[PDB]
Curated annotation (Swiss-Prot), chain A:
GO biological process terms on file: pH reduction; proton transmembrane transport
UniProt organism field: Bos taurus (Bovine)
Alphabetic keyword roster: Acetylation, Cell membrane, Cytoplasmic vesicle, Hydrogen ion transport, Ion transport, Membrane, Phosphoprotein, Synapse, Transport
Tissues where this protein is expressed: Expressed in brain (at protein level).
Gene (name only): ATP6V1E1
Family membership: Belongs to the V-ATPase E subunit family.
Cellular-component GO terms for this entry: apical plasma membrane; clathrin-coated vesicle membrane; cytosol; endosome; synaptic vesicle membrane; vacuolar proton-transporting V-type ATPase, V1 domain
Protein name (Swiss-Prot/TrEMBL): V-type proton ATPase subunit E 1
GO terms of molecular function: proton-transporting ATPase activity, rotational mechanism
Job description of the protein: Subunit of the V1 complex of vacuolar(H+)-ATPase (V-ATPase), a multisubunit enzyme composed of a peripheral complex (V1) that hydrolyzes ATP and a membrane integral complex (V0) that translocates protons. V-ATPase is responsible for acidifying and maintaining the pH of intracellular compartments and in some cell types, is targeted to the plasma membrane, where it is responsible for acidifying the extracellular environment.
Quaternary state and interactors: V-ATPase is a heteromultimeric enzyme made up of two complexes: the ATP-hydrolytic V1 complex and the proton translocation V0 complex. The V1 complex consists of three catalytic AB heterodimers that form a heterohexamer, three peripheral stalks each consisting of EG heterodimers, one central rotor including subunits D and F, and the regulatory subunits C and H. The proton translocation complex V0 consists of the proton transport subunit a, a ring of proteolipid subunits c9c'', rotary subunit d, subunits e and f, and the accessory subunits ATP6AP1/Ac45 and ATP6AP2/PRR.
Compartments reported by the entry: Apical cell membrane; Cytoplasmic vesicle, Secretory vesicle, Synaptic vesicle membrane; Cytoplasmic vesicle, Clathrin-coated vesicle membrane
Curated annotation (Swiss-Prot), chain B:
Places the protein is found: Melanosome; Cytoplasmic vesicle, Clathrin-coated vesicle membrane
Summary of the tissues where the protein is detected: Expressed in brain (at protein level).
Cystine bridges: none
Protein name as it appears in the record: V-type proton ATPase subunit G 2
Coiled coil: 3-52
Membership in a protein family: Belongs to the V-ATPase G subunit family.
Biased composition (Basic and acidic residues): 30-50
Species this protein is from: Bos taurus
Function recorded in the entry: Subunit of the V1 complex of vacuolar(H+)-ATPase (V-ATPase), a multisubunit enzyme composed of a peripheral complex (V1) that hydrolyzes ATP and a membrane integral complex (V0) that translocates protons. V-ATPase is responsible for acidifying and maintaining the pH of intracellular compartments and in some cell types, is targeted to the plasma membrane, where it is responsible for acidifying the extracellular environment.
Stretch of the intact protein here: 6 to 59 of 118
Subunit structure: V-ATPase is a heteromultimeric enzyme made up of two complexes: the ATP-hydrolytic V1 complex and the proton translocation V0 complex. The V1 complex consists of three catalytic AB heterodimers that form a heterohexamer, three peripheral stalks each consisting of EG heterodimers, one central rotor including subunits D and F, and the regulatory subunits C and H. The proton translocation complex V0 consists of the proton transport subunit a, a ring of proteolipid subunits c9c'', rotary subunit d, subunits e and f, and the accessory subunits ATP6AP1/Ac45 and ATP6AP2/PRR.
Amino acid sequence: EKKEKQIEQQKKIQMSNLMNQARLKVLRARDDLITDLLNEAKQRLSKVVKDTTRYQ
Amino acid sequence: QGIQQLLQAEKRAAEKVADARKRKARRLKQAKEEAQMEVDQYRREREQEFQSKQ
């Protein structure tokens, strides 16, 4: 009852850490879709600097 | 005669008391080694619990 209980407490922690890393992976991929969108908004802002009538 | 033979007839029952100790000296130990070889069922239980752990 000590071998079976210490294995099942670590088997649950092995599965719970797997879904913990799965939750952070979709959250980190969602952050990359905001990062390049912010990066795309920065490159399109430099084209407003390119023409002179809209920039002034 | 009668007095010397009655001490040898009591000596036959004197070995009946030593056989009464012989029946409780081995049976206390021949069953205790059977109570120590019963761990092979417990080694079978640890081997069976290593199957469900696998």
